[PDB]
Amino acid sequence: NNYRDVEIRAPRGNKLTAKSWLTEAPLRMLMNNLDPQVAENPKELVVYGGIGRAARNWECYDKIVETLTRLEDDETLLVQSGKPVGVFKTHSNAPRVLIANSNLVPHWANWEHFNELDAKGLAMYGQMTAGSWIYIGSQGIVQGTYETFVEAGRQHYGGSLKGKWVLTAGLGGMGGAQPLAATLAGACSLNIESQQSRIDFRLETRYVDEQATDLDDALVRIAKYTAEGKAISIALHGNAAEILPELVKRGVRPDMVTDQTSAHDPLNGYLPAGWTWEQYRDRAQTEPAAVVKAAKQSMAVHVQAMLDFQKQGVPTFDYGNNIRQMAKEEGVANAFDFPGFVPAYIRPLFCRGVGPFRWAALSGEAEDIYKTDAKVKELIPDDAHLHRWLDMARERISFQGLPARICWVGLGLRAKLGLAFNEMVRSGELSAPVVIGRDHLDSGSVSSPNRETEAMRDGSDAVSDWPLLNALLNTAGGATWVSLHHGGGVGMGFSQHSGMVIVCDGTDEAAERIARVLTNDPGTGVMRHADAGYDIAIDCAKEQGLDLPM
Amino acid sequence: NNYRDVEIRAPRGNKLTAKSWLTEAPLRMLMNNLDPQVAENPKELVVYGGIGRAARNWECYDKIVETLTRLEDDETLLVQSGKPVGVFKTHSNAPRVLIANSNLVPHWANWEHFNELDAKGLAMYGQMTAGSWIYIGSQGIVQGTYETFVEAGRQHYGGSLKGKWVLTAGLGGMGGAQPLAATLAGACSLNIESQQSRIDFRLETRYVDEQATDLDDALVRIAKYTAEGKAISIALHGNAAEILPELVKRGVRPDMVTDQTSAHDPLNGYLPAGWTWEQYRDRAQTEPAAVVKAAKQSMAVHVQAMLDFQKQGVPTFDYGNNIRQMAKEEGVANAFDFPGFVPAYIRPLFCRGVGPFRWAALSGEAEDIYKTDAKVKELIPDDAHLHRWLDMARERISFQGLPARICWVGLGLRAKLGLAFNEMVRSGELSAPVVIGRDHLDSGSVSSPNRETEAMRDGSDAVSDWPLLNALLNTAGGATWVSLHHGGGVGMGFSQHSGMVIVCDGTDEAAERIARVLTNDPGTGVMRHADAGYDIAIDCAKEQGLDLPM
């Protein structure tokens, strides 16, 4: 019921299995989430991010496909932690699917209780885009990581990073974007990863350039490439909790230090020092409580090394995996002496509603995305940073599963782009409808005190009204599917967030929904930051004519 | 800031202040929440249930009224912990208001952090119906309390409570329903209450019969009235944490024991033994941490007395204020040896979608409600228990603020009732539109392991996907306002829940919305309990033709 030896991929072209494009779309994107070229471990329904799954188990998968296939134009399917639990009458301008995954009443919102519920067949971890069917492989995060490194470069090094290098770890589905992101930002990088198969996946998808044979070889490569102003990513097979302390000991000074192991889930996502992956997985079923303690003890040593780098003047930051919290719980009292990437670097972008906006071509045709890329350039003719992004994406980002594009834009341009794409479907320029979504990391869709809402200027870090309002509003406006998840990114107890996806099928009805939903979705994030008192947000609100009563 | 010396009441009759009845309705219900005859402390914006407020502060109140008055028929107001934060374009079939109150990311979901935020002007406790504008005074809970006592009587005493008495505490807004509910179930009751003013309010609203002069006198009255087979409610001014242990010491044997003090909020809602309310309110400002400890210490003593009664064979239960949890935290390890009222008594009703369904006449006219009562009897001709409820309500429940009715009905009948009421508005039988709602305590709208989802047969107590899906579904189907709240009933950390209200303005468009909303809302509760594997819920789902894919 949790393992199936099948390769799944999204249906291609313009023939429908479901009754309409609005139901065909979630059917295709659920399948795309499990593409061998997209997902980390799809035979076990795992997309990314530890145990982030697409459906609760294989029986539930089958039933969701069957239900979407028959769903009428005025019906809405409810998905409850990856299970299709009910279908109810709404109307054609409401979402076809409403998804709520991994939500636990706060006092019980921890991995121990989640795992008890999972053993009873009652649980599924949605991560962010895993359980809400809008994962596009490593591309979904790569621009956000690039923008983080770019901003860190602007703050610390004068912008570009030629001759500099990043030290980090984690080459999973999302951590795998770190090497390429650093490269695109002009840095060399050393990326430690404990599973060879994960390094291979990154090499095969062009996300990492090369693999060193040991730490010494990695250091000779970094010294050489940085001296020559090359921007090349190196993988190193090993354990970050062993390597980072050793580098501190050798007096090695990276230009930036971060981490993107799956520290958010000690049982599943983080290899204790000295263990093989095989021992880790075997012991997780036998003695889970001991495994969690071992993993967190290693996280503590890992974080002290990051702290030690920072004490040497190295820009150090948390890249959103809750590792500081885990170290803090294990006695590293000053774990939060280095900041999260959002307060440090990315929040100003969120203040204008900018974030990991994305779209996918349901046709399966690369040229559909290239036509969107050209149309974005036409609609935003005077943003060279963004034109450069799309050029870098064309050159360096290989499609995984259905062709898709990441393109960070905010309030105003989201709706302009969506309406233009919908006109391109209408005219036949695009071969089939496109879907427009985003990560749940976005300006108005997440509350997460150790990540996206860390150190809000007004102290409102833990206020989670906002993502709940965002999902409610996306439903009222007519997103095609809308999601409310708990614990994405940072793990059980630490986040609540919303998702949205909307289908551009060329119709006038789609256009009226698009204009609303792609205004409102970034609008809520500009609102949320204006509420906190950010002048950049307030300014953007005024420019864009938001109605913010207070 | 939080105090204004004004008397607020809902506008009456057919003249609109706002632009339509869809926006006039929330405007009137917000004001009705603060009516001097309805609310516990409306000069401080407090409705019930400790510090359950209608708006965050008076500046926010003013702006909500101002905004509601101008809100257009295709706009939606977002309310974020009692603050009007944004207005966004949706459509006429979406809710006019979307409300999210008191939501905190789980690791921070506690009173200590809520109070930090409140001090900064960032918080408001919504309770259930306080911040979502559907409170109708003590009537909202009275049928639920009655059904609880009736079912306990059926389980332990062969049904009727004639010659029996209930011992309880708390005569606040919701606890004040206890005396009258016991009376209606045939029992006499002793009701202990620490504030004379609250006793007075219950006397003024005819929810309690008489006040004893002291404990000895109270017991004389209980002895007399039970011997005579009368059903009289007695208020006793004092502290439950003192009186219950004393009654145990005296060997006094009540026929059932419960509690409904505001134990869910140790800082504001529970008087420590020996203190006065005035000492309590002042010291909560100076020494909150010491006040909390003193309150919880008294709750431990109080719960131990409850446990001691139970050991003597007295039916004892928790009536939904989280007191067991507080006692357990203070070292009463067996605090949960007596059950909550929902697993003990009420869950079977929830399995058929039955719960605190209610409506209010925006006209202000008592005869509008009487006409609805007669319509319900016509549409449900063969349920004598329900006819008897409506007879008792007519005879013994006096209106507070806008005339309103509590009437517990479930899946199928809710929609039948709502469409009929909408017909009566259209025809002019009713003088003005009515609003249909409910408590957030309902089959499909709440997760609360120490209350509504305590001891779910499948262990799914903590799974909170369901209320979130209920809110999203109510939004998609066209409720007039929809709410998502945290911590209602049981306090910060212990619940998540949804609210809905829909306006019956006599239009065909309202009818289309009502038909599906009043199906879907109880439908989700039948779904939720069928998912948990309750045969009565599965049966109901089949009878009502629900589409439950699994």
Ligand SMILES: NC(=O)c1ccc[n+]([C@@H]2O[C@H](COP(=O)([O-])OP(=O)(O)OC[C@H]3O[C@@H](n4cnc5c(N)ncnc54)[C@H](O)[C@@H]3O)[C@@H](O)[C@H]2O)c1
């Ligand atoms: N900041 C963001 O914008 C953002 C976005 C998405 C995900 N995330 C978070 O990023 C983290 C990584 O996500 P993912 O999809 O790559 O996860 P994943 O589970 O697919 O991969 C994690 C990788 O970490 C490796 N690893 C674990 N322990 C290690 C150790 N001690 N030394 C070296 N490598 C080790 C594993 O081998 C695995 O390949 C997660 O915590 C996720 O929640 C952050």
Ligand SMILES: NC(=O)c1ccc[n+]([C@@H]2O[C@H](COP(=O)([O-])OP(=O)(O)OC[C@H]3O[C@@H](n4cnc5c(N)ncnc54)[C@H](O)[C@@H]3O)[C@@H](O)[C@H]2O)c1
């Ligand atoms: N079971 C349900 O269906 C349900 C529904 C609504 C509310 N509730 C809960 O019921 C409880 C009471 O709600 P309410 O609206 O009456 O609250 P309230 O705050 O208006 O009143 C609480 C009352 O308890 C009294 N009190 C506090 N400590 C006392 C003590 N030690 N001894 C005697 N009296 C004491 C106060 O004087 C006050 O009058 C809350 O916990 C609320 O969350 C339960």
